[PDB]
Write a protein that binds this ligand. Structure first.
Ligand code: 7DD
Ligand code: MG
Length: 382
């Protein structure tokens, strides 16, 4: 008895969970009221493990004892060149254990813990499970979980293993861009179609060319950038305010990690607000040296600060087209996935790339992966 099967987007930076209930997909909000959850772990001084928003939001002078971006390590060996490059940018200790890159952190009271990447991902899955369980008012045992299309055998297996640690039977692993297409019902169409999935998220950018024929998807080609996303757009805005504050006050605020953390949280909030309004205020009491911070950001200025990075997203799209032996006019469907596709300028540049073709619309782009997983989970629940 598989009970109510859940659909989980286990994301690099943000995860999402949904279920099929009363004839439709329901995307479930977590205990902080958010329909997405950061793939983030941290610890209190008392040694309590925090997961999700609470972990990401905890102010700290010790980023080395937070864990995030475990998806960059999952299913890879310690000596994988990708791992050896990624660890340069991660503030937490990564150590070789049993051929793998385990994560070593201090959790409180001088206690040290070492975790496999799948154990970290299992923590996030546990949080997504608890989210679903609170919504349904009962336990969940089975899930459909998504992975990037480029995930290999070990990465898929390690994701299943993370499920298992979390007490979830991962019944099916499905590809992210495929799940997005399913969310839009592109699998329920007749004939042979080419689908371009443009997935611009928090830390990663993935472009996928799918073909759909007779209900079966084929991933023809993939491309993107493993270190481009909304975090990068945030940092351009951070740089801008950090420089302006120095120019006003003579002080550089990077000396204080808590100040940088506060500013990053408000900047990300303003960025989001600027996808639906033209100006946002950034305010922080006791920002730095007991002085308050109060500045505004316009949509135009946000765009100007990131325009080169926005425009860089088209190059991977042109590459997947060349690799698929396709031209722009061969694309029958454009699917926008990922939170950063809420940015009006991104929408605009994708549409202009495709000479005025409108993309699929109606599902929140940061939810579309979980949505698709949930559609399949509905069928499996019966
Ligand atoms: N309304 C908005 N306007 C602009 N960007 C938005 C939003 C809402 C979320 N975001 C940005 O989306 C990024 C996370 O994307 P995601 O697909 O949820 O995460 P992931 O699957 O980990 O790449 C994050 O960088 C998050 O800040
Ligand atoms: Mg994603």
């Amino acid at each position: 008895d598989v009970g109510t099967v859940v659909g989980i987007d286990l994301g690099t930076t943000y995860s999402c969970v949904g279920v099929f209930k009363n004839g439709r997909v329901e995307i479930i909000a977590n205990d902080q009221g958010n329909r997405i959850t950061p793939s983030y772990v941290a610890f209190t001084p008392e040694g309590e493990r925090l997961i999700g928003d609470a972990a990401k939001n905890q102010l700290t002078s010790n980023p080395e004892n937070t864990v995030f971006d475990a998806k960059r390590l999952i299913g890879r060996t310690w000596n994988d060149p990708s791992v050896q490059q990624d660890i340069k940018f991660l503030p937490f200790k990564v150590v070789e254990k049993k051929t793998k890159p385990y994560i070593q952190v201090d959790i409180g009271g001088g206690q040290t813990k070492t975790f496999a990447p799948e154990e970290i991902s299992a923590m996030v899955l546990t949080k997504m499970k608890e989210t679903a369980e609170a919504y349904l008012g009962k336990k969940v045992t089975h899930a459909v979980v998504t992975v990037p299309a480029y995930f290999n055998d070990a990465q898929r297996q390690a994701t299943k293993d993370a499920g298992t640690i979390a007490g979830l039977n991962v019944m099916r692993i499905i590809n992210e861009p495929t799940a997005a297409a399913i969310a839009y019902g592109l699998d329920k169409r007749e004939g042979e179609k080419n689908i371009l999935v443009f997935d611009l998220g928090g830390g990663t950018f993935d472009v996928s060319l799918l073909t759909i024929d007779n209900g079966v998807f084929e991933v023809v080609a993939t491309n993107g950038d493993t270190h481009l996303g909304g975090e990068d757009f945030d940092q351009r805005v951070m740089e801008h305010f950090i420089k302006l504050y120095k120019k006003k006050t003579g002080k550089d605020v990077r000396k204080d990690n808590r100040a940088v953390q506060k500013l990053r949280r408000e900047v990300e909030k303003a960025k989001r607000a600027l996808s639906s309004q033209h100006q946002a205020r950034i305010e922080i009491e006791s920002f730095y040296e007991g002085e308050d911070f109060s500045e505004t950001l316009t949509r135009a200025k946000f765009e100007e600060l990131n325009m080169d990075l926005f425009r860089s997203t088209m190059k991977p799209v042109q590459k997947v087209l060349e690799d698929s032996d396709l031209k722009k006019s061969d694309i029958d469907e454009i699917v926008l996935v990922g939170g950063s596709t809420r940015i009006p300028k991104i929408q605009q540049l994708v549409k202009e790339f495709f000479n005025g073709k409108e993309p699929s619309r109606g599902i929140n782009p940061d939810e579309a992966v979980a949505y698709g997983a949930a559609v399949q989970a509905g069928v499996l629940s019966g």
